[PDB]
Amino acid sequence: TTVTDCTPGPNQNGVTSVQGDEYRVQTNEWNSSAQQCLTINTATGAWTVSTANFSGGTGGAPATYPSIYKGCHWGNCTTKNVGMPIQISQIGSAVTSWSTTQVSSGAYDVAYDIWTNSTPTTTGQPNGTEIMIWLNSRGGVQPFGSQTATGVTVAGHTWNVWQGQQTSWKIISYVLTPGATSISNLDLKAIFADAAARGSLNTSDYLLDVEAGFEIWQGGQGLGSNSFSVSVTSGASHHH
Ligand SMILES: OC[C@H]1O[C@@H](O[C@H]2[C@H](O)[C@@H](O)[C@H](O)O[C@@H]2CO)[C@H](O)[C@@H](O)[C@@H]1O
Ligand SMILES: [Cl-]
Ligand code: NA
Ligand code: NA
Ligand SMILES: [Zn+2]
Ligand SMILES: [Zn+2]
Ligand SMILES: [Zn+2]
Ligand SMILES: [Zn+2]
Ligand SMILES: [Zn+2]
């Protein structure tokens, strides 16, 4: 069925299990109490920002990051066919696809948020790397830190790379150039190898989760997720 979740931030997070709890959709209004509603299809995992009209500047922190994820966010973990936590260096393959709905108004990014951590579990802020993958953005926002590379080829696409330092973790943001509304079979293992070559990622870290959604500074109504998949593997074959 379809569920609507308007859980107000900044201190509450409304989390909805979709597709047999292979994915969770979170309101995650971590920096605002302004109205934000998500409408979520629990059979398909499709979701929309059905009500939002954020107000504020385009600099600094966004208001919110409503998102879908596989894995663990601040100890809230999916439970079907997860494949995480896993040491980065032990991944056989890691692939994701995301199809979005965008609006030509407001100030937002359309981004993956991928967390790594020194230990396989945490109840809070991961301490390794935050890997962001910006499919698109508008309204004057930019990534955290500084732009350190322009027009590089990684995992079959062209990016600008931004690197920064947070209070207890490193951030690297891959900005698809030009931006787009979807990406198909993105090789995250290739992104991790690149992030490690650029000095942003320790491949001994555990991959905790793969999230996708919208950091919103202004507006936000009508942004959505049409389809989302993440597959992280190896171990070994064994029909039993
Ligand atoms: O505050 C975390 C937030 O930073 C965002 O980037 C800021 C940047 O740090 C600031 O120097 C510049 O003035 O504004 C941008 C936003 O436009 C980053 O985009 C977010 O991913 C991150 O959550
Ligand atoms: Cl920085
Ligand atoms: Na599945
Ligand atoms: Na602001
Ligand atoms: Zn959160
Ligand atoms: Zn961040
Ligand atoms: Zn491309
Ligand atoms: Zn493309
Ligand atoms: Zn690869």
Author numbering: 2 to 241
Report text from the authors:
GuxA is a multi-modular and multi-functional enzyme from Acidothermus cellulolyticus whose catalytic domains include a xylanase/endoglucanase GH12 and an exoglucanase GH6, representing a unique combination of these two glycoside hydrolase families in a single CAZyme. GuxA on the other hand contains an N-terminal GH6 domain linked to a CBM3 followed by a GH12 catalytic domain linked to a CBM2 on the C-terminal end. GuxA shows an optimal temperature range between 75 and 80 °C for all three substrates, which is well above the optimal growth temperature of 55 °C for A. cellulolyticus.
